[PDB]
Design an enzyme around this catalytic site. Structure first.
Site, PDB file in Angstrom:
ATOM      1  N   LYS A  22       0.822  -1.199   0.000  1.00  0.00           N
ATOM      2  CA  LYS A  22       0.000   0.000   0.000  1.00  0.00           C
ATOM      3  C   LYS A  22       0.861   1.255   0.000  1.00  0.00           C
ATOM      4  CE  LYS A  22      -1.926   1.525   3.761  1.00  0.00           C
ATOM      5  NZ  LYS A  22      -1.373   2.899   3.865  1.00  0.00           N
ATOM      6  N   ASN A  23       1.866   1.253   0.876  1.00  0.00           N
ATOM      7  CA  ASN A  23       2.795   2.360   1.028  1.00  0.00           C
ATOM      8  C   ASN A  23       3.851   2.523  -0.041  1.00  0.00           C
ATOM      9  OD1 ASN A  23       0.965   3.313   2.872  1.00  0.00           O
ATOM     10  ND2 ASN A  23       2.202   2.730   4.658  1.00  0.00           N
ATOM     11  N   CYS A 115      -4.168  13.638  13.814  1.00  0.00           N
ATOM     12  CA  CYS A 115      -4.390  12.233  13.497  1.00  0.00           C
ATOM     13  C   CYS A 115      -4.467  11.453  14.780  1.00  0.00           C
ATOM     14  CB  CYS A 115      -3.259  11.693  12.595  1.00  0.00           C
ATOM     15  SG  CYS A 115      -3.232   9.893  12.275  1.00  0.00           S
ATOM     16  N   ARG A 120       1.951  14.364  14.111  1.00  0.00           N
ATOM     17  CA  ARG A 120       2.604  14.082  12.848  1.00  0.00           C
ATOM     18  C   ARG A 120       2.776  15.323  11.994  1.00  0.00           C
ATOM     19  NH1 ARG A 120      -0.453   8.902  10.445  1.00  0.00           N
ATOM     20  NH2 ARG A 120       1.436   8.920   9.147  1.00  0.00           N
ATOM     21  N   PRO A 121       3.589  16.288  12.441  1.00  0.00           N
ATOM     22  CA  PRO A 121       3.734  17.477  11.599  1.00  0.00           C
ATOM     23  C   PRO A 121       4.375  17.146  10.291  1.00  0.00           C
ATOM     24  CG  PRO A 121       5.384  17.489  13.274  1.00  0.00           C
ATOM     25  CD  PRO A 121       4.416  16.391  13.652  1.00  0.00           C
ATOM     26  N   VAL A 161      14.481  10.906  10.413  1.00  0.00           N
ATOM     27  CA  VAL A 161      14.377   9.981   9.310  1.00  0.00           C
ATOM     28  C   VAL A 161      12.910   9.924   8.976  1.00  0.00           C
ATOM     29  CG1 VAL A 161      14.616   7.577   8.638  1.00  0.00           C
ATOM     30  CG2 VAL A 161      16.405   8.720   9.935  1.00  0.00           C
ATOM     31  N   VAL A 163       9.993   8.873   6.083  1.00  0.00           N
ATOM     32  CA  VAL A 163       9.517   8.318   4.835  1.00  0.00           C
ATOM     33  C   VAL A 163       8.769   9.368   4.042  1.00  0.00           C
ATOM     34  CG1 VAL A 163       7.785   6.767   3.863  1.00  0.00           C
ATOM     35  CG2 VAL A 163       9.441   5.947   5.581  1.00  0.00           C
ATOM     36  N   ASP A 305       4.450  -0.324  11.936  1.00  0.00           N
ATOM     37  CA  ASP A 305       3.276  -0.907  11.278  1.00  0.00           C
ATOM     38  C   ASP A 305       2.986  -2.346  11.685  1.00  0.00           C
ATOM     39  OD1 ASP A 305       2.659   1.608  10.225  1.00  0.00           O
ATOM     40  OD2 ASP A 305       3.181   1.066   8.175  1.00  0.00           O
ATOM     41  N   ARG A 397      -8.726   0.346   4.611  1.00  0.00           N
ATOM     42  CA  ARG A 397      -7.775   1.315   4.099  1.00  0.00           C
ATOM     43  C   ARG A 397      -6.435   0.717   3.778  1.00  0.00           C
ATOM     44  NH1 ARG A 397      -6.002   6.897   5.430  1.00  0.00           N
ATOM     45  NH2 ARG A 397      -6.658   6.785   7.609  1.00  0.00           N
TER      46      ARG A 397
HETATM   47  C1  LIG Z   1       0.276   4.845   9.368  1.00  0.00           C
HETATM   48  C2  LIG Z   1       0.701   4.422   8.156  1.00  0.00           C
HETATM   49  O1  LIG Z   1       2.034   4.094   7.692  1.00  0.00           O
HETATM   50  C3  LIG Z   1       3.009   5.062   7.911  1.00  0.00           C
HETATM   51  C4  LIG Z   1       4.090   4.488   8.889  1.00  0.00           C
HETATM   52  O2  LIG Z   1       4.464   3.263   8.377  1.00  0.00           O
HETATM   53  C5  LIG Z   1       5.307   5.439   8.893  1.00  0.00           C
HETATM   54  C6  LIG Z   1       6.533   4.731   9.425  1.00  0.00           C
HETATM   55  O3  LIG Z   1       7.308   5.833   9.863  1.00  0.00           O
HETATM   56  O4  LIG Z   1       5.688   5.944   7.571  1.00  0.00           O
HETATM   57  C7  LIG Z   1       4.736   6.500   6.640  1.00  0.00           C
HETATM   58  O5  LIG Z   1       4.110   7.774   7.234  1.00  0.00           O
HETATM   59  P1  LIG Z   1       4.995   9.033   7.443  1.00  0.00           P
HETATM   60  O6  LIG Z   1       4.164  10.072   8.010  1.00  0.00           O
HETATM   61  O7  LIG Z   1       5.405   9.340   6.135  1.00  0.00           O
HETATM   62  O8  LIG Z   1       6.184   8.657   8.345  1.00  0.00           O
HETATM   63  P2  LIG Z   1       7.295   9.532   8.809  1.00  0.00           P
HETATM   64  O9  LIG Z   1       7.502  10.732   8.002  1.00  0.00           O
HETATM   65  O10 LIG Z   1       8.404   8.619   8.589  1.00  0.00           O
HETATM   66  O11 LIG Z   1       7.238   9.891  10.297  1.00  0.00           O
HETATM   67  C8  LIG Z   1       8.159   9.372  11.257  1.00  0.00           C
HETATM   68  C9  LIG Z   1       8.349  10.303  12.490  1.00  0.00           C
HETATM   69  O12 LIG Z   1       8.729  11.581  11.933  1.00  0.00           O
HETATM   70  C10 LIG Z   1       7.838  12.578  12.362  1.00  0.00           C
HETATM   71  N1  LIG Z   1       7.858  13.659  11.327  1.00  0.00           N
HETATM   72  C11 LIG Z   1       7.683  13.342   9.974  1.00  0.00           C
HETATM   73  C12 LIG Z   1       7.712  14.340   9.014  1.00  0.00           C
HETATM   74  C13 LIG Z   1       7.921  15.726   9.409  1.00  0.00           C
HETATM   75  O13 LIG Z   1       7.954  16.648   8.624  1.00  0.00           O
HETATM   76  N2  LIG Z   1       8.080  15.934  10.747  1.00  0.00           N
HETATM   77  C14 LIG Z   1       8.063  15.007  11.692  1.00  0.00           C
HETATM   78  O14 LIG Z   1       8.229  15.364  12.851  1.00  0.00           O
HETATM   79  C15 LIG Z   1       6.548  11.847  12.562  1.00  0.00           C
HETATM   80  O15 LIG Z   1       5.347  12.647  13.058  1.00  0.00           O
HETATM   81  C16 LIG Z   1       7.061  10.608  13.372  1.00  0.00           C
HETATM   82  O16 LIG Z   1       7.245  11.082  14.791  1.00  0.00           O
HETATM   83  C17 LIG Z   1       3.601   5.441   6.531  1.00  0.00           C
HETATM   84  N3  LIG Z   1       2.569   5.972   5.623  1.00  0.00           N
HETATM   85  C18 LIG Z   1       2.652   6.066   4.286  1.00  0.00           C
HETATM   86  C19 LIG Z   1       1.478   6.644   3.600  1.00  0.00           C
HETATM   87  O17 LIG Z   1       3.584   5.728   3.612  1.00  0.00           O
HETATM   88  C20 LIG Z   1      -0.233   4.186   7.093  1.00  0.00           C
HETATM   89  O18 LIG Z   1      -0.215   3.024   6.665  1.00  0.00           O
HETATM   90  O19 LIG Z   1      -0.934   5.120   6.721  1.00  0.00           O
HETATM   91  C1  LIG Z   2     -18.999   8.284  10.117  1.00  0.00           C
HETATM   92  C2  LIG Z   2     -17.920   7.903  11.123  1.00  0.00           C
HETATM   93  O1  LIG Z   2     -18.236   7.524  12.222  1.00  0.00           O
HETATM   94  N1  LIG Z   2     -16.557   7.965  10.815  1.00  0.00           N
HETATM   95  C3  LIG Z   2     -15.990   8.613   9.583  1.00  0.00           C
HETATM   96  C4  LIG Z   2     -14.659   9.340   9.985  1.00  0.00           C
HETATM   97  O2  LIG Z   2     -13.821   8.365  10.566  1.00  0.00           O
HETATM   98  P1  LIG Z   2     -12.947   8.683  11.930  1.00  0.00           P
HETATM   99  O3  LIG Z   2     -13.901   9.248  12.897  1.00  0.00           O
HETATM  100  O4  LIG Z   2     -12.224   7.498  12.318  1.00  0.00           O
HETATM  101  O5  LIG Z   2     -11.863   9.803  11.793  1.00  0.00           O
HETATM  102  P2  LIG Z   2     -11.027  10.886  10.944  1.00  0.00           P
HETATM  103  O6  LIG Z   2     -10.061  10.204  10.105  1.00  0.00           O
HETATM  104  O7  LIG Z   2     -11.955  11.892  10.405  1.00  0.00           O
HETATM  105  O8  LIG Z   2     -10.310  11.351  12.375  1.00  0.00           O
HETATM  106  C5  LIG Z   2      -9.390  10.581  13.144  1.00  0.00           C
HETATM  107  C6  LIG Z   2      -9.000  11.440  14.385  1.00  0.00           C
HETATM  108  O9  LIG Z   2      -8.279  12.538  13.900  1.00  0.00           O
HETATM  109  C7  LIG Z   2      -8.903  13.744  14.258  1.00  0.00           C
HETATM  110  N2  LIG Z   2      -8.779  14.685  13.068  1.00  0.00           N
HETATM  111  C8  LIG Z   2      -9.026  14.229  11.719  1.00  0.00           C
HETATM  112  C9  LIG Z   2      -8.921  15.035  10.611  1.00  0.00           C
HETATM  113  C10 LIG Z   2      -8.531  16.459  10.801  1.00  0.00           C
HETATM  114  O10 LIG Z   2      -8.405  17.266   9.898  1.00  0.00           O
HETATM  115  N3  LIG Z   2      -8.298  16.862  12.151  1.00  0.00           N
HETATM  116  C11 LIG Z   2      -8.405  16.038  13.294  1.00  0.00           C
HETATM  117  O11 LIG Z   2      -8.179  16.498  14.405  1.00  0.00           O
HETATM  118  C12 LIG Z   2     -10.365  13.452  14.638  1.00  0.00           C
HETATM  119  O12 LIG Z   2     -10.823  14.328  15.663  1.00  0.00           O
HETATM  120  C13 LIG Z   2     -10.233  12.007  15.172  1.00  0.00           C
HETATM  121  O13 LIG Z   2      -9.893  11.983  16.560  1.00  0.00           O
HETATM  122  O14 LIG Z   2     -14.093   9.940   8.816  1.00  0.00           O
HETATM  123  C14 LIG Z   2     -13.775   9.050   7.681  1.00  0.00           C
HETATM  124  C15 LIG Z   2     -12.976   9.872   6.649  1.00  0.00           C
HETATM  125  O15 LIG Z   2     -11.960  10.608   7.307  1.00  0.00           O
HETATM  126  C16 LIG Z   2     -15.105   8.300   7.182  1.00  0.00           C
HETATM  127  O16 LIG Z   2     -16.084   9.228   6.696  1.00  0.00           O
HETATM  128  C17 LIG Z   2     -15.696   7.576   8.416  1.00  0.00           C
HETATM  129  O17 LIG Z   2     -16.867   6.904   8.000  1.00  0.00           O
HETATM  130 MG   LIG Z   3      -7.895   9.509   9.802  1.00  0.00          MG
END
Ligand SMILES: C=C(O[C@H]1[C@@H](O)[C@@H](CO)O[C@H](OP(=O)(O)OP(=O)(O)OC[C@H]2O[C@@H](n3ccc(=O)[nH]c3=O)[C@H](O)[C@@H]2O)[C@@H]1NC(C)=O)C(=O)O
Ligand SMILES: CC(=O)N[C@H]1[C@@H](OP(=O)(O)OP(=O)(O)OC[C@H]2O[C@@H](n3ccc(=O)[nH]c3=O)[C@H](O)[C@@H]2O)O[C@H](CO)[C@H](O)[C@@H]1O
Ligand SMILES: [Mg+2]
EC number: 2.5.1.7
Length: 419
Positions: A22-23, A115, A120-121, A161, A163, A305, A397
């Site tokens: 996926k990634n 999130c 995750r900035p 580091v 990704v 993961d 997802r």
């Molecule tokens: C959940 C999934 O998977 C995620 C994890 O596997 C993760 C492993 O680290 O990497 C990737 O997200 P990521 O966000 O890219 O991963 P980092 O940048 O490596 O994050 C690692 C650490 O770095 C901090 N950070 C990252 C970027 C930045 O600008 N500033 C900063 O502070 C961050 O907040 C962490 O504390 C993956 N997602 C995708 C889509 O590829 C998923 O399947 O969706």
């Molecule tokens: C209807 C329901 O029950 N859940 C919906 C909701 O899942 P979810 O409720 O699982 O969450 P989400 O991905 O919208 O949020 C996950 C967490 O992140 C937080 N958050 C998310 C986005 C953002 O811009 N800022 C922030 O603070 C949010 O308050 C929550 O605590 O949204 C999905 C798309 O995203 C789908 O529509 C799901 O069906």
């Molecule tokens: Mg979400």
């Protein structure tokens, strides 16, 4: 709202065909934005995240098609903004920023809010772009990047580091003027594939897989046909699944050299592991897993993961196990859920102390993580009785037809349509 009706215990057994990562496909798709010619991406998993990314691409003017592969045509990108309404459901959306500005001189992407897995900035992304010349601003929630002509190659050293930021910097650097060097870059298999993909399109990249990636800017990117690598996470998830059930399984369409840490952790736990060029076999020989200690970290170390999965493993293992998160100090939602199921665990900051138990009980749980939440399904397979998993939208997802894959293993799982 979709839900899982899982009934166990069950001794997983059989065969499963690992899907494309996926990634890997995500950053690859976003990378196709650069391609000036039709591109055929093979081995793409059928999952929510892919739907989202396809939809996003479409919003930009990209021609999209799909089955096992994805047919991408970016020749006519006419839009450059990734809408709040879409980004708010997939932070990965930010991936469209670099390609857009790198090729068009512009691009906007709703700045991702919070999130559930924690802080995750995306600071590294912007930073990375600025170093390339991108003039970036923040308007009403939108990250507005703009460059006068081409971007310039630069020597960038990464604070962390990442990704995400490595793909952003890497991808955009392919069309930049001059040489770009990413020091302290991510070494995730998915980065290597995104680069391989890029190279196939006619880009110039070296050092993929190492802590030093070097990109040589080029005129433009053609089209072609790339094959996405196998999903390491899915595989580790399947392996763990068999390993906590006394299972005997086989993994088809795999790539063993992406699980070294998981593989070793598994053997350590006590399983019989054999591997081939593109397959992996696991047999618990009718044994309850042994507690193991895990420490998440950048590849090739234990991946976060797989963290939840391993937590589950310890929950039913003999002995005291320990999980320590160093990537997402907040990725523990699963714990209080598994504890509902009869598990024993303690949480101290980024570490969770595991106390294995002989059994788990069927109960009602709630998914909240597109990957950790899988542990919940795995839990219901070996637990005693019936487990109802709520919010499986998360799992859809990061998992292609998970119930089907599990079923082909003996799992007693059923999808439930009405909440
Ligand atoms: C959940 C999934 O998977 C995620 C994890 O596997 C993760 C492993 O680290 O990497 C990737 O997200 P990521 O966000 O890219 O991963 P980092 O940048 O490596 O994050 C690692 C650490 O770095 C901090 N950070 C990252 C970027 C930045 O600008 N500033 C900063 O502070 C961050 O907040 C962490 O504390 C993956 N997602 C995708 C889509 O590829 C998923 O399947 O969706
Ligand atoms: C209807 C329901 O029950 N859940 C919906 C909701 O899942 P979810 O409720 O699982 O969450 P989400 O991905 O919208 O949020 C996950 C967490 O992140 C937080 N958050 C998310 C986005 C953002 O811009 N800022 C922030 O603070 C949010 O308050 C929550 O605590 O949204 C999905 C798309 O995203 C789908 O529509 C799901 O069906
Ligand atoms: Mg979400």
């Amino acid at each position: 709202m979709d839900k899982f009706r899982v009934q166990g215990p069950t001794r997983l057994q059989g065969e499963v065909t690992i899907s494309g990562a996926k990634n890997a496909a995500l950053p690859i798709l976003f990378a196709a934005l650069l391609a000036e010619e039709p591109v055929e991406i093979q081995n793409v998993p059928k999952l929510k995240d892919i739907d989202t990314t396809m939809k996003l691409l479409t919003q930009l003017g990209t021609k999209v098609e799909r089955x096992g592969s994805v047919w991408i045509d970016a020749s006519n990108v006419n839009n450059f903004s990734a809408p709040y309404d879409l980004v708010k459901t997939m932070r990965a959306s930010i991936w469209a920023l670099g390609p857009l500005v790198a090729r068009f001189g512009q691009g906007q992407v709703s700045l991702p809010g919070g999130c559930a897995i924690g802080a995750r900035p995306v600071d590294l992304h912007i930073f990375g772009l600025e170093k390339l010349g991108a003039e970036i601003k923040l308007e009403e929630g939108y990250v507005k990047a703009s460059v006068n002509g081409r971007l310039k190659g630069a020597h960038i050293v990464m604070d962390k580091v990442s990704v995400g930021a490595t793909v952003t910097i890497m991808s955009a650097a392919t069309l930049a003027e001059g040489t770009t060097i990413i020091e302290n870059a991510a070494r995730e298999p998915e980065i290597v594939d995104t680069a391989n993909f890029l190279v196939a399109l006619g880009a110039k990249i070296s050092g993929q897989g190492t802590d030093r990636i070097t990109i040589e800017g080029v005129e433009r990117l053609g089209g072609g046909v790339y094959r996405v690598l196998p999903d390491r996470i899915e595989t580790g998830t399947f392996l763990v699944a068999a390993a906590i059930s006394g299972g005997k399984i086989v993994c088809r369409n795999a790539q063993p050299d992406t699980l070294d840490a998981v593989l070793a952790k598994l053997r350590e736990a006590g399983a019989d592991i054999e591997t081939g060029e593109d397959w992996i076999s696991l047999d618990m020989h009718g044994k309850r897993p042994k507690a193991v200690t895990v420490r998440t970290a950048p590849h090739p170390a234990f991946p976060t993961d797989m963290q939840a999965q391993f937590t589950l493993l310890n929950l039913v293992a003999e002995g005291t196990g320990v999980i320590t998160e160093t990537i997402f100090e907040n990725r523990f939602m699963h714990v209080p859920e598994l504890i509902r199921m009869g598990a024993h665990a303690e949480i101290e900051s980024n570490t969770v102390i595991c106390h294995g138990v002989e059994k788990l009980s069927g109960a009602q749980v709630m998914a909240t993580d597109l990957r950790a939440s899988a542990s919940l399904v795995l839990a219901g397979c070996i637990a005693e009785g019936t487990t109802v998993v709520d919010r499986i939208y998360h799992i859809d997802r990061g998992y292609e037809r998970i119930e089907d894959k599990l079923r082909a293993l003996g799992a007693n799982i059923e999808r439930v349509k009405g909440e």
